[PDB]
Every structure is written in structure tokens, then in C-alpha cells.
Design a protein around this nucleic acid. Structure first.
Ligand SMILES: Nc1ncnc2c1ncn2[C@@H]1O[C@H](COP(=O)(O)OP(=O)(O)OP(=O)(O)O)[C@@H](O)[C@H]1O
Length: 529
RNA sequence: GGGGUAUCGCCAAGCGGUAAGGCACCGGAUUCUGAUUCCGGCAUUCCGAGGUUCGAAUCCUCGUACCCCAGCCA
């Protein structure tokens, strides 16, 4: 329960409403991100919790910033999270004729006029945050005059910025938004849905409340920056012949630590090619998060945890990571892979190898097991062997013995160094009666696999508050290794999380893998305590 | 000038009857993943100072801090 559900509860109880109809209205000018996933969870969750409806509506009022590529991807990520909208996908452009009729009602009532103050002047006349504005000299044109000028606008007789339609409200209102807000502006741009049918386009505030009213939305839920806007939401509905009047309720937007959400910015990372694109595994986008190896279930959980309040806030990545870990620990089948490897040969070994039956899940016998080939000449992780180390160190020291994962208790003996003092190979003994744990991969049956170690994109917690967020990008956000994995990883499917034991949960990058060379993105590391 | 918000390091519940929960953190037990699981510790205190009350985070003053708004963006 949250403050919005308590409102919805009262409404139902008092008999204000019988059903609840919410909506998610992204503008199609970019890919959805983790913050959007919070609206999706809120809006679609309430609908299904109350057996109500939730429309997916593309708020497509600004043609020059939107593109058809985003509509298809948005529908894509909404479904992926496991949510379905009510009926058909809707578009604000679906209401362009309605919106136009409504502007006319306003004009006929004298509550709107065609102003000719330039784009620079309108700002000058608007006042400031402490100084009231002033009426444009074009404010008292006759209704008959406004209809003519508006139709001329509609007919493309005015150049961009040469005229716009404004609401005749209050230039001295303490709400900057009520200072004669623009309702329509001229843009000679092709619209991704309406082609070149329209050269005048409605502004968010005029389009949004009328669309909600037409769709019979009972509660418009948006973020806190729209609290002021709400006054205009109600003013529009109060002055046009519409039979319902939805109510807006604002909650606080999600801010994730170490990442930026501003689509303007995310777009710059993609435009300047600093990431591979919107679905780069370092991006806070839903598709990026998906390619990274997250699961819709881990995200819905994240939403459940962070809550819905009016408080500004900033979640730590630790909270997000906790979610995916919890999910993958349960459902991810374990496997073996070595990221940085140094060869290890057991001399006391007899035979061209053998087979070790390893389980697909150490805490869930029900998941089955597999035949992992064991051998004498294997591959181990460089950071697992140490010539000298204290008690704490519970791995392979040049002195004692260590257990190979589900195999034999080997025993370090000699080490063969390369010219530059680097260990090239290790020599050890073992006693076949055995069967300090480390992971390994039989060199003979090792599958060369590229591993991508992803880290946080930025090196400060609020790169948003930086003068130049770009200069604060983490150069180690992606570190590419070459390692080896047990041959079973040959059958991995894109987006199927595996837990490389003692490393983390990884998943096959569908975008870079092939036949010989598979690419694995590291979703999240283990609790490296 | 106006509109909001103030509860553990980060989220968050509480709606006059005496501070839930989660992430993180610290221990202690188990463990062929320094993982998982288990055990326990984690706000006499709710931005501050004063009021009312038997009892206030919650009600009342009176301050303080932060966030939002001046796109023909959403
Ligand atoms: N960080 C966020 N946290 C919660 N809800 C968000 C967040 N960002 C956007 N939303 C929600 O998603 C809805 C659709 O957002 P929309 O795509 O229209 O714009 P935006 O993403 O907020 O802005 P921009 O295009 O500049 O990134 C908004 O009405 C809002 O409720």
C-alpha cells in the first residue's frame, strides 16, 4: 500500500469510482529506462490489482523529437516486463481532430487567442519567478479574429514561431504555467503517425488532460515536476464540454546512484558512441538491463521494494543488484569458467582424462547434473594461486592442498615462471582417494569464451549533478577478458543466466556471440566478502 | 513569488496509545561456491525550539533545510 492506493481505496469506498483506469504515457523519443519501469509497475500493477484497465498511450505531440523506432521498442519493453495494456495502443495523435475542436471551443468562449509575440518576446512578457507577467498586445482580438488567424495557422499561412495559440488565463498568476500557456505551435515537420496532415501541434498540457478524459482515465499518475501543471490540467477540463474530469496525482521520480536517466543525456552517450547503443549492458535502459542479464521478475521486485512516496530519493545500486542476485541464485544453473587463466598440470595423473559428475545446482538436487570432463592438465584462475600468503587466504598456496571444484584435492608443488617473473604454469600432485575450493577447466575440453566484465558507467554517484557528465565516465565500465568455460556452455541461449561459480551470474550476449566464440556479459558479481 | 518534502548509511511503514520492513553493515553457526541458508546486533528516537495531552513522530505555534516552476519540450 502507498499513498496512491489509499486514495484509490477511498475513491472506491466512497463510491466516487466503481472502476480504476490508469495509463502509461511515454513520449516516443527514446528507449524506456529503469525509472520508467517504476511508472509501468505503478500504473499497470494498480490496474491488475483492482481488476481495472491501464492504457498504453504514446504521448506523441512533438514530431521533431519522436521516431517510429521508439514506439516498437516501447511496446516491446512493456510486454517484456510482463504487463499488457487495455485494448489497442493509443496515441495522442489519435486525438488531433478532437484537440483541434476543443481549441475552437476555447476560442469561441474568448478563452484563447492567436498571439504574435515572437518566441523571444513571449519569454520577456511572461514575468519571472517573483515578477508578474504582462498581457500581450494581441490579447484582446475578437473571437471572429482568432478563428480566422487560427485557421490560417492550421492552413500553414504562418511561419514557424510566427504565431501560436495561447490560453487567456492570468499573466500575474503565481503559477508560471497559468500565464497564458501556449496550446498550439507551428511545426512543419512530418509526424510519424499523421504524416504531413498537420502543421500545427498541441502542447503537452492541452493534449494530456483531454486525452485522459476521452479515455475515461480515473487517476492520472505522474511525477512530481507536474504538480504545478495540475492547475492547467484542471483549468482545461473545467472550460470545455467534456463529461468527466480525471484527477492527477504526483509521486516522486526514481534516481539511481551512479547513472543518469535524462533521455537527453542517454541520447548523448549513444549519439557520441560512448556506449554501443540504447541496449548497451551499461545503460540504465530496460533493454540494456535485459541484455545485461536482468530478469523482468527482478525489476518488478525492485519496483516493489523502492516504494511510491512524495519524497525525493536516490536508491543505491546495491538495492538493484540485491534483486537480480536473489533471482538468479534460485534459478540459475551453476557452471565453470575461468576468466584470467594460468595453466596447471597434475603430473601424478594417469589417462587421457576422465569424467566428473557435477550438479547443476548445489542447493537444489532437483535441477539435474552433468558430466564435466576432468583431466591432469587443466586451467585455473591466476588470482587463485599464491606462492606465499597468510592464514586468511583459503586457496592454493605453494605449500598446502586445495580442493578442485567437485574433483580432486590437489597439492601445489613446483611453479614454472616466465622470464618476466610471471607464473606460466603450475605443477601439483593429487590422491585419487579424494572425491580451500577453487574452480577449474580441463584444458583439453576448454571452450574459449570471451567474457565482458561490466562495471558502473560513472565514477561519481550523481553524474547528473556534474558540469560535464561525460568527463566523469568510468573508463573501466567494460573490461574484456578471454577465458575458458566447460564445453557445456556450448549450448547456452541468449539471455539465460548461468552462475559461473565463485565469479558471478553471466549470460550470453546475443549481440556479439557466434559459433566458435561465445560472448558472456557478467550480469552481477557475487557477494565478494 | 508559488507549489511540495522532512523517520537509521540508502529506501520505507506509522494517521494520539509509547518507532514495521528491506538494502547495506557487524558479529556467531553451517557449507566442496570467501556464495546460499541460519543466529543475533543494528532510531528511548522521528529537521529545530517551544505548546496542548495521562500519553505526540504523529495536534499547535514559530523557525530551518532541500526539491520543483520562468520550452512555441514532456
Ligand atoms: N525517473 C522516473 N521515475 C519515475 N517515473 C518516471 C521517471 N522518468 C519518467 N517517469 C514516468 O514515465 C512517464 C513517461 O515519461 P516520458 O517518456 O513521457 O518522459 P521522461 O522520460 O520523464 O522525460 P525525458 O524524455 O526527458 O527522459 C512519465 O509520466 C513519468 O510518470
Amino acid at each position: 500500500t502507498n499513498f496512491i492506493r489509499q486514495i484509490i481505496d477511498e475513491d472506491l469506498a466512497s463510491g466516487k469510482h466503481t472502476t480504476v483506469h490508469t495509463r502509461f504515457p511515454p513520449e516516443p523519443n527514446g528507449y524506456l529506462h529503469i525509472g520508467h519501469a517504476k511508472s509501468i509497475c505503478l500504473n499497470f500493477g494498480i490496474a491488475q490489482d483492482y481488476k481495472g484497465q491501464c492504457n498504453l498511450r504514446f504521448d506523441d505531440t512533438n514530431p521533431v523529437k519522436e521516431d517510429i523506432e521508439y514506439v516498437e521498442s516501447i511496446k516491446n519493453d512493456v510486454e517484456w516486463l510482463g504487463f499488457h495494456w487495455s485494448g489497442n495502443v493509443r496515441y495522442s495523435s489519435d486525438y488531433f481532430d478532437q484537440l483541434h475542436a476543443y481549441a475552437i471551443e476555447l476560442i469561441n468562449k474568448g478563452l484563447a487567442y492567436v498571439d504574435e509575440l515572437t518566441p523571444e518576446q513571449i519569454r520577456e512578457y511572461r514575468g519571472t519567478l517573483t515578477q508578474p507577467g504582462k498581457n500581450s498586445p494581441y490579447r484582446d482580438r475578437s473571437v471572429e479574429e482568432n478563428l480566422a488567424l487560427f485557421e490560417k495557422m492550421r492552413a500553414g499561412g504562418f511561419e514557424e514561431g510566427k504565431a501560436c495559440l495561447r490560453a487567456k488565463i492570468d499573466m500575474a498568476s503565481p503559477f508560471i504555467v497559468m500565464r497564458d500557456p501556449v496550446l498550439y505551435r507551428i511545426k512543419f515537420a512530418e509526424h510519424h503517425q499523421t504524416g504531413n496532415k498537420w502543421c500545427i501541434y498541441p502542447m503537452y498540457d492541452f493534449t494530456h488532460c483531454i486525452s485522459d478524459a476521452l479515455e475515461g482515465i480515473t487517476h492520472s499518475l505522474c511525477t512530481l515536476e507536474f504538480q504545478g501543471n495540475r492547475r492547467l490540467y484542471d483549468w482545461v477540463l473545467d472550460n470545455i464540454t467534456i463529461p468527466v474530469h480525471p484527477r492527477q496525482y504526483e509521486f516522486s521520480r526514481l534516481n539511481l546512484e551512479y547513472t543518469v536517466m535524462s533521455k537527453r543525456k542517454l541520447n548523448l552517450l549513444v549519439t557520441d558512441k560512448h556506449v554501443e547503443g540504447w541496449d548497451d549492458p551499461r545503460m540504465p535502459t530496460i533493454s540494456g538491463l535485459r541484455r545485461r542479464g536482468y530478469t523482468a521478475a527482478s525489476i518488478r521486485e525492485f519496483c516493489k521494494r523502492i516504494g511510491v512516496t512524495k519524497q525525493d530519493n536516490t536508491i543505491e545500486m546495491a538495492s538493484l543488484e540485491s534483486c537480480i542476485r536473489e533471482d538468479l541464485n534460485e534459478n540459475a544453473p551453476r557452471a565453470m569458467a575461468v576468466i584470467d587463466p594460468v595453466k596447471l598440470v597434475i603430473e601424478n595423473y594417469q589417462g587421457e582424462g576422465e569424467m566428473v559428475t557435477m550438479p547443476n545446482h548445489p542447493n537444489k538436487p532437483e535441477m539435474g547434473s552433468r558430466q564435466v570432463p576432468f583431466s591432469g592438465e587443466i586451467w585455473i584462475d591466476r588470482a587463485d594461486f599464491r606462492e606465499e600468503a597468510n592464514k586468511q587466504y583459503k586457496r592454493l598456496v605453494l605449500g598446502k592442498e586445495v580442493r578442485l571444484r567437485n574433483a580432486y584435492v590437489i597439492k601445489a608443488e613446483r611453479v614454472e615462471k616466465d622470464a618476466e617473473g610471471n607464473i606460466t604454469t603450475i605443477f601439483c600432485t593429487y590422491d585419487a582417494d579424494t572425491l580451500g575450493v577453487i574452480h577449474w577447466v580441463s584444458a583439453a575440453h576448454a571452450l574459449p569464451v570471451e567474457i565482458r566484465l561490466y562495471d558502473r558507467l560513472f565514477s561519481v554517484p550523481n553524474p547528473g549533478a556534474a558540469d560535464d557528465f561525460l568527463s566523469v565516465i568510468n573508463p573501466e565500465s567494460l573490461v574484456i577478458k578471454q577465458g575458458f568455460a566447460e564445453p557445456s556452455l556450448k549450448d547456452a541461449v541468449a539471455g539465460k543466466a548461468f552462475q559461473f561459480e565463485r565469479e558471478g551470474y553471466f549470460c550470453l550476449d546475443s549481440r556479439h556471440s557466434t559459433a566458435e566464440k561465445p560472448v558472456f556479459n557478467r550480469t552481477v558479481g557475487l557477494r565478494d566478502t
